[PDB]
Symmetry: C2
Subunit: 328 residues, 2 copies
């Protein structure tokens, strides 16, 4: 089959632009025994791609995950029709020998979109699950501050927090995202771009401070939040998207005198640390919570593979309510 | 009784200067029942005073600890002659009701200087004890990076690490301090002020990276050290002295992408968290290790109460080998 592929023509400077991407067509080689041919059904764009793209050489395929269907098979375990998760990058077709492939949960129902395996019941949901439950170690009754709270990770973080008996304070980048999270049952939601004083807004959202901080943004926003952590407060360091598209130098680090006096524990993590029984258990919990109504989901489906860079840039700018997904 | 007292005349701007301090004489009231009159024998000056002094109002007494002798007693538990640790600030005499007082270890011998209870077998030694053994959680075989390594805290950290079976790499601020730490048994010691590249020196000191980082300095030094932490490395955040006397804005924070990829655990602490049985047990371990020779000690005794500001400023600027102590 003929395949389409998005490649990094020029390393990003600040935010990506259309000129930074280049579409290339290629013919795929024939299948050898044991291999399968995968047709992409849904591809994801995620903030981490902005950082990962710096490690690429110009001309390389952009990295990313997809839900795909086996359309040609010489592997009996993966017959035609099998749905899998694969990470060949931003490409419409690929060949795999089956080792780097994951099948969906065997209990996956036909009533939830297949693309949820890239969002709330996929990598972002697992990031929220372990970052909140093990790094922050929330145990109930605490107050959690989560930013980028309408994103793929943040929205799952807040909903798990509510389901564990927590107060949740969410910061988002648009008025539409404020309304969306209020429907979900977030205690406080505010638009960090428009508030008069971020420090006063956080103080009013939790005058006694915050037990936990699920941090996706970093930068100066996290310096202000660190000034309102309770003593022995815990910060889960997940991402720093406010810094990824920076053109200048990094902002000042968190004020060390506040950090010491409050004796904060700040641990970073990557979702891929958890595997095996622990990972399967978390995925099942995510699916159960979705079907019970305890976790709601929202998607922003963009049609057309060659619109993928536009989907990535819009996601980077906070312009899309719900998980940005490209339908092939 | 008459007392002398050093007070903060003007909040420090950068490093302190002489005009920021003011000496005042006053007469103390008579003792009420249950109270004692304490005469200072040894007073300590410590880096934390630079930060703590910012919370004072002008005219307040400078904070600090001292070894003192009861010269008048209406308190049955604390008769005349009793030696105690007390924290009335930079004063030659004070009155206490006994509740904020600490008694010496009953196993404290007369063969070691009394002033050691303010240094290696006092608060700085306890800071090293808990920061290294519980925050970093060293278990033997690890490689520890310690800065301000010839100071009261840093020097104890390295020596405890050696007796626990660890490699220690110490950074100090003077050539005289380099010889001192090699005599104590540090694996690598270097003068961070004079090396051509801090990054290259740390790499040659430990090509495998560092399991633990006992951080007293903060700032850019810690950004470089963070770039050489092993995966899941632990940082004990004790102080940031490179920042206490800062006049401009804070330097850039550690690169969040390195922090996340390495999944570092960075926890701050204050020595006063540990009290009761735990504190006395650690003190007994410090005294025992001192008496066994496993922990060596050095003091820089400055005579005269009226020299306390000069002793404090010299300590802040790195001009003193060993624990700075003022003999009244």
């Amino acid at each position: 089959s003929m395949t389409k592929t998005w490649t990094l023509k020029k390393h990003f400077v600040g935010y990506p632009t259309n000129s930074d991407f280049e579409l290339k067509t290629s013919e795929l080689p024939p299948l050898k025994n044991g291999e399968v041919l995968l047709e992409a059904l849904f591809l994801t764009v995620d903030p981490y791609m902005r950082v990962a793209a710096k490690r690429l050489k110009e001309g390389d395929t952009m990295m990313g995950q997809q839900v795909a269907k086996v359309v040609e098979s010489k592997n009996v375990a993966l017959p035609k029709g099998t749905i899998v998760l694969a990470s060949p990058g931003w490409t419409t077709h690929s060949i795999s020998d089956g080792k780097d492939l994951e099948k969906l949960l065997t209990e996956w129902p036909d009533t939830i979109p297949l693309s949820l395996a890239l969002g709330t019941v996929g990598m972002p949901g697992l990031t929220a699950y372990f970052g909140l439950l093990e790094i922050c170690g929330v145990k109930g009754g605490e107050t959690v501050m989560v930013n980028a709270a309408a994103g793929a990770v943040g929205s799952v973080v807040g909903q798990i927090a509510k389901l564990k008996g927590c107060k949740v304070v969410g910061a988002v980048g648009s008025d539409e995202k404020v309304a969306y999270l209020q429907k979900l049952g977030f205690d406080v939601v505010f638009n960090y771009k428009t508030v008069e004083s971020l420090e006063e807004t956080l103080k009013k959202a939790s005058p006694d401070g915050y037990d936990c901080y699920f941090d996706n943004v970093g930068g100066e926003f996290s310096n202000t939040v660190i000034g309102q952590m309770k003593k022995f407060g815990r910060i889960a360091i997940c991402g720093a998207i406010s810094t990824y598209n920076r053109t200048g130098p990094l902002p000042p680090g968190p004020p060390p005198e506040i950090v010491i006096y409050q004796e904060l524990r700040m641990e970073a993590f990557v979702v891929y640390r958890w595997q095996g029984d622990a990972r399967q258990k978390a995925l099942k919990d995510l699916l159960k919570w979705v079907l019970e109504g305890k976790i709601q989901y929202k998607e922003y489906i963009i049609e057309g593979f060659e619109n993928m860079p536009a989907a990535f840039m819009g996601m980077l700018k906070g312009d899309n309510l719900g998980k940005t997904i490209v339908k092939a």
